[PDB]
């Protein structure tokens, strides 16, 4: 009979990079979604498959909460049926996605003068991701036909490139932290109600 800890997902001052987007399970708890939609300070709050009011009295068996940091223009790629450097290479949502996508500006938290080079993004990958598939490989992207032997050079590139966030960057390139919720149902008894 515990409340679901959405806050320690939201109050975390270290979100992981988008290539190693971070997964927390929310279960065995009654859920208070009412503090989320009533915040009204997000720059992006979409729900996909369920109305935000109706989901409070709705029972689920497991809630997965993805959380990561992307760029401002790349918030549009977190949606079922999008492409780009984030949807193909970093974080792919399924087409039958049943969760809510939450995003807020964090130019102030996550940028600093001289560039916050801590947040990385996989700029190259051979094949595109499955839904919810994580690629944390630092293996050299063979851009050509010559094998690389794991060094950099001609047609041999490192995949994890770094976002350089300054606070003077424009609104399209300010670091918008994103927390993607995901809801599921099984034959198991529902652990997440509200």
């Amino acid at each position, epitope marked *: 009979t515990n409340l679901c800890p959405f806050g320690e997902v939201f109050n975390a001052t270290r979100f992981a990079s988008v290539y190693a987007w971070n997964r927390k399970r929310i279960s065995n708890c009654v859920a208070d979604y009412s503090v989320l939609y009533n915040s009204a300070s997000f720059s992006t709050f979409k729900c996909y498959g369920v109305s935000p009011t109706k989901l409070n009295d709705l029972c689920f068996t497991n809630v997965y909460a993805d959380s990561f940091v992307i760029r401002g223009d790349e918030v549009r790629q977190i949606a079922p049926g999008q492409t780009g450097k984030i949807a193909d290479y970093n974080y792919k949502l399924p087409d039958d996605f049943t969760g809510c996508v939450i995003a807020w500006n964090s130019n102030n938290l996550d940028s600093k003068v001289g560039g916050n080079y801590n947040y990385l993004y996989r700029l190259f990958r051979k094949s595109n991701l499955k839904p919810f598939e994580r690629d944390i*490989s630092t293996e050299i992207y063979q851009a050509g036909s010559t094998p690389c032997n794991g060094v950099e050079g001609f047609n041999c590139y*490192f995949p994890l490139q770094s976002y350089g966030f300054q606070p003077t960057n424009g609104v399209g390139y300010q670091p918008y932290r994103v927390v993607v919720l995901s809801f599921e149902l099984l034959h198991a008894p529902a652990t997440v109600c509200g």
Partner: antibody, heavy 123, light 111 residues
């Protein structure tokens, strides 16, 4: 052919250990090289890690502020400059590598661990 | 160590023993994959079970891992004298932003 790592150490509290980790072999300047600790007779503990083609350094919240992990890709050697801990710092310090398979889930190391530097702090 | 794992197990050579790695909702239960490690005494530890159910190059087929929700199982079949070792489960953790290990099980064969 596996990995190179500096020999055993005995230190005083307040001094500092810079234990090296030479590319025991394989790819280096393109792989996350971590550091894992083991207190003698105790369980393993991750310490930190770098991706020595950039210079990013993650650390555990326990070992934060004291350890600094760096590498020079010209010499293919990592470093683990621990600042000082008093008496429970005595532990064998392996030097794991990091592959990072794609899919679901996360880091397994390589199998490449160093032979084990036992840095003992004592008076 | 965050990943709860028993102190030790004990079995017979030829028997089957199973080593539990129970985590939390942030480390194992959150879909991250466990990794099992073999430490022979006085040796540098090595890769045992790869990627939650897989194997690296050079391990017998007696070791196999699995995962069911907020748990894991290091399935060891047909215990041996060279299986007396310490077994550490590694599963990455979400809230810590770091790869946490397990409690370690000393495998003791009898006879």
């Amino acid at each position: 052919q596996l990995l190179q790592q500096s020999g055993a150490e005995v230190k005083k509290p307040g001094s500092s250990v810079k234990v090296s980790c030479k590319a025991s072999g394989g790819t280096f300047s393109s792989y996350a090289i971590s550091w894992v600790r083991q207190a003698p007779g105790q369980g393993l503990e991750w310490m930190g890690g770098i991706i020595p083609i950039i210079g990013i350094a993650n650390y555990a919240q326990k070992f934060q502020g004291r350890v600094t992990i760096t590498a020079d890709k010209s010499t293919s050697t990592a470093y683990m400059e621990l600042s000082s801990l008093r008496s429970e710092d005595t532990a064998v310090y392996y030097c794991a590598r990091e592959r990072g398979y794609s899919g679901y889930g996360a880091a397994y190391y390589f199998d490449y661990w160093g032979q084990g530097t036992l840095v003992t702090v004592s008076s | 160590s965050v990943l709860t794992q028993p102190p030790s197990v004990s079995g017979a050579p030829g028997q089957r023993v199973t080593i539990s790695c129970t985590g939390s909702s942030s480390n194992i239960g959150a879909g991250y994959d466990v990794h099992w490690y073999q430490q022979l005494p006085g040796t540098a530890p090595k890769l045992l079970i790869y990627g939650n159910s897989n194997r690296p190059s050079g391990v017998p087929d007696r070791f196999s891992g699995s995962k069911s929700g907020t748990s894991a199982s290091l399935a060891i079949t047909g215990l041996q004298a060279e299986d007396e070792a310490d077994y550490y489960c590694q599963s990455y953790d979400s809230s810590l932003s770091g790869s946490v290990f397990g409690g370690g099980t000393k495998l003791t064969v009898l006879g």
